[PDB]
Symmetry: D2
Subunit: 116 residues, 4 copies
């Protein structure tokens, strides 16, 4: 799994479950093209987005649907989403974990990049 996403909820102290995640890749023409999508599991983790073959060099955007997450819990959140945009695999293939921690008016994100 060269790309994994993990989401936590800072209000409840829990994994953020059933969070939709959409991944895009910048095309030659500078537009965002769909790349992969999925939803977090009961552990707040999303595996299986992509493969070593499909996850080529490029500029990727990981868009985490924070707004729907909070709205489902009955809460009115501030942000439309949380996005992470980065260049991947420039110096050869790497594994990337994008982690996010969510509150209604705030989020943080970190990347863990490892060399297979």
């Amino acid at each position: 799994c060269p790309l994994m996403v993990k989401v936590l909820d800072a209000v409840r102290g829990s994994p953020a479950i059933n969070v939709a995640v959409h991944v895009f890749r910048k095309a030659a023409d500078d537009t965002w093209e769909p790349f992969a999508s999925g939803k977090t599991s009961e552990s707040g983790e999303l595996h299986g987005l992509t493969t070593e073959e499909e996850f080529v060099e490029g500029i990727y955007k990981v868009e985490i649907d924070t707004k729907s997450y909070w709205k489902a819990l009955g809460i009115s959140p501030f942000h439309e989403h949380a996005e992470v945009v980065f260049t991947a695999n420039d110096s050869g293939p790497r594994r990337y974990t994008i982690a996010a921690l969510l509150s209604p008016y705030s989020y943080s994100t970190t990347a863990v990049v490892t060399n297979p």
Copy 2:
């Protein structure tokens, strides 16, 4: 003063100075219209972006050029930028704390 951006550096323990910030408003065709821009000051703050009459309800995007910031300090960064997207509903401070492989953002709405 309806909209202010404040940027902090978690590596140096300082304001993030001379950070480029561009603000956009979402247009009816779902594209992003330029709205405001500037560079953070010596205090890491960017004031004077808009006025009450100009800042209508809508979806706004604050694009912070974190990559140029880190490169100007000689530090290797992960992100292309940090973009913060929110709805304004009828004073907003967008605050960001930057590290090379992470960022945090909060809204202070008073």
Copy 3:
């Protein structure tokens, strides 16, 4: 103004108002001597804690009473408090962003 504390609320998107803050300095016997205290203001800030002559080099602890803060809002919190411990070496802002099960802290030293 050598020492300021600023507290923000990530749930409400606001300053964290009326938060109790106690500052201590580490004594030669490794116990903690009271140094300063106060409650954050309407802006989430606590100024006027010390003076330049009083704030000598040493190890300082800033204890923020996050549990009382959350309970006064009717919200169930994880932590007993948030304590931030650092060395002052010859202006410091200790900033904290609070959530019920998490907190973040940074130092702005100028």
Copy 4:
């Protein structure tokens, strides 16, 4: 494992490896007593601190030695440590993950609490 600690490095985008962690429990007399200690692994994780039998109700303090971590990397950090202090198991046994994200002048911490 009722108590786990995970540490990440926000500068390098990596697990924070070889971080010392000391856990204390408040005694009857209101002092901190040693409870357990260990160091993070190559994954930035510390397992095996305690057991279901030993991890009784109480007020616990998890002290993460951030200062030594940065100093070993040749960096002068701001904080002496990062601590997390919480009441555990008050409404019955729970599993607790304390996660921390480190930068030289900043840290964040979150708790993930689950019901076995």
